[PDB]
């Protein structure tokens, strides 16, 4: 019920960990580098942030969320001087399974199933549910931010970048919609999981198009055949509620988690999906 508070280590990280120039990824606030425990030689991930109040907010919110199995765990946080400038160094568990959509691309002749999508969405949902329950909104749920623990098949998907996360804060009525942003993100992820293409795309496929922005505002998405031919109307309706243009009309995480598709993944059919194939073909377009 009660869990330890964040104990920021003032000892030099070099004492405990061996720092490498290898960059696992770029976080919005700071670069993420692979590091190894000197004692155990175990791989870990280091996020380096300058000691601004925004950085302190990120580390606090991440620490609260670290408990969730579907949120990347912060093993330790270090306050150290780099170049005589105060830095917060966040050591997290290394996720080498790779981005969610990258793993689906790398599955070969084996086809992605509706049931597999339901399981994936439930995992992401559980993370969002924990965050919303503790009054935190990630505000940056994206495919990049979802990563797998290991290349082994029973690896767990985890949410990662808390740079944009913000606190949402006798019987009484419950009365920001920062939380609603996360639900929209789930809808987009779900759409891509089922077909392998985003609900909203740019003419000439260049970054963010004015036309794409208009489509997002107008909520102009279609479920095109053949990708959506075998997808349940139930699933389509769920996506519609998640992709409502008006944030207030958008589905709550509790509603999403109680939805039968999410709640009973086992019941969900193993209908084959075009997602794996589409992702491979899109990669081929990117790599001419």
Curated annotation (Swiss-Prot):
Report the principal subcellular site.
cytoplasm
Task: Give the source's domain of life in one word.
Answer: Eukaryota
What reaction(s) does this enzyme catalyze?
L-seryl-[protein] + ATP = O-phospho-L-seryl-[protein] + ADP + H(+); L-threonyl-[protein] + ATP = O-phospho-L-threonyl-[protein] + ADP + H(+)
Q: Which organism is it from?
A: Homo sapiens (Human)
Q: Which residues form the Protein kinase domain?
A: 18-262
| PTM entry text | Sumoylation inhibits the protein kinase activity.
| Activity regulation annotation text | Activated following phosphorylation by p38-alpha/MAPK14 following various stresses. Inhibited following sumoylation. Specifically inhibited by pyrrolopyridine inhibitors.
What residues does staurosporine bind to? 93-95
- Record protein name field: MAP kinase-activated protein kinase 2
Per the UniProt entry, what is one GO biological process?
p38MAPK cascade
**What EC identifiers does the entry list?**
2.7.11.1
